[PDB]
Structure 1
Amino acid sequence: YPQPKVLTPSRKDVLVVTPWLAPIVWEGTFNIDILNEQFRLQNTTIGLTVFAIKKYVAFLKLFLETAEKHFMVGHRVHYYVFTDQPAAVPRVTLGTGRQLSVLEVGRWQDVSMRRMEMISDFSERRFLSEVDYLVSVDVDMEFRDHVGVEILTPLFGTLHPSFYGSSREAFTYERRPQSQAYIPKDEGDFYYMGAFFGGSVQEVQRLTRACHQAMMVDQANGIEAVWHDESHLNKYLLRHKPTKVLSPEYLWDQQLLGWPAVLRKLRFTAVP
Structure 2
Amino acid sequence: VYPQPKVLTPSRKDVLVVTPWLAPIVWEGTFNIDILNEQFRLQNTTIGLTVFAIKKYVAFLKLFLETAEKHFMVGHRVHYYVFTDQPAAVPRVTLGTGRQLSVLEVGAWQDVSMRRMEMISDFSERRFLSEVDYLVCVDVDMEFRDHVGVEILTPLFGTLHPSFYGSSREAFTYERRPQSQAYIPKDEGDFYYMGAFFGGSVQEVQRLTRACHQAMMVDQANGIEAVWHDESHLNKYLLRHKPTKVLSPEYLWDQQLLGWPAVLRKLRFTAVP
TM-score, length basis structure 2:
0.99
> Post-superposition shift, 1:107?
7.8
Q: Distance in 1 between matches of 2:215 and 2:146?
A: 35
Q: Distance in 2 between matches of 1:125 and 1:159?
A: 29
> Post-superposition shift, 1:35?
0.0
Aligned match of 1:270: 271
* Contact 1:120-1:209 at 8 Å conserved across structures: yes
> Post-superposition shift, 1:128?
3.4
CA spacing shift, 1:80–1:23, aligned 2, 3 Å = same
* Contact 1:145-1:267 at 8 Å conserved across structures: yes
> Post-superposition shift, 1:114?
0.3
Which SS does the other structure have where 2:116 is aligned?
helix
Q: Distance in 1 between matches of 2:128 and 2:27?
A: 28
Higher mean displacement: 128-137 or 35-44: 128-137
Over the matched positions of the two proteins, sequence identity in percent amounts to 99
Q: Distance in 1 between matches of 2:26 and 2:218?
A: 34
* Contact 1:47-1:127 at 8 Å conserved across structures: no
Q: Distance in 2 between matches of 1:116 and 1:126?
A: 18
Aligned match of 1:129: 130
CA spacing shift, 1:228–1:76, aligned 2, 3 Å = same
Aligned match of 2:22: 21
Q: Distance in 2 between matches of 1:163 and 1:210?
A: 24
Gaps in structure 1 of 5+ consecutive residues = none
After superposition, give the CA deviation of every residue in 1:75-101 in whole Å (9 maximum; x if it has no partner). Answer: 000000000001110000000000000
> Post-superposition shift, 1:127?
5.5
> Post-superposition shift, 1:126?
3.6
Q: Distance in 1 between matches of 2:108 and 2:123?
A: 21
Aligned match of 2:252: 251
Q: Distance in 1 between matches of 2:142 and 2:98?
A: 23
> Post-superposition shift, 1:129?
1.0
Q: Distance in 2 between matches of 1:208 and 1:31?
A: 31
Runs of 4+ aligned structure 1 residues displaced above 2 Å come to none
Aligned-residue Cα RMSD (Å) equals 0.7
* Contact 1:25-1:244 at 8 Å conserved across structures: yes
Which SS does the other structure have where 1:134 is aligned?
strand
After superposition, give the CA deviation of every residue in 1:144-175 in whole Å (9 maximum; x if it has no partner). Answer: 00000000000000000000000000000000
> Post-superposition shift, 1:67?
0.1
Which SS does the other structure have where 1:217 is aligned?
helix
> Post-superposition shift, 1:34?
0.1
> Post-superposition shift, 1:70?
0.0
> Post-superposition shift, 1:125?
1.1
Gaps in structure 2 of 5+ consecutive residues = none
After superposition, give the CA deviation of every residue in 1:210-262 in whole Å (9 maximum; x if it has no partner). Answer: 00000000000000000000000000000000000000000000000000000
After superposition, give the CA deviation of every residue in 1:37-70 in whole Å (9 maximum; x if it has no partner). Answer: 0000000000000000000000000000000000
> Post-superposition shift, 1:130?
3.3
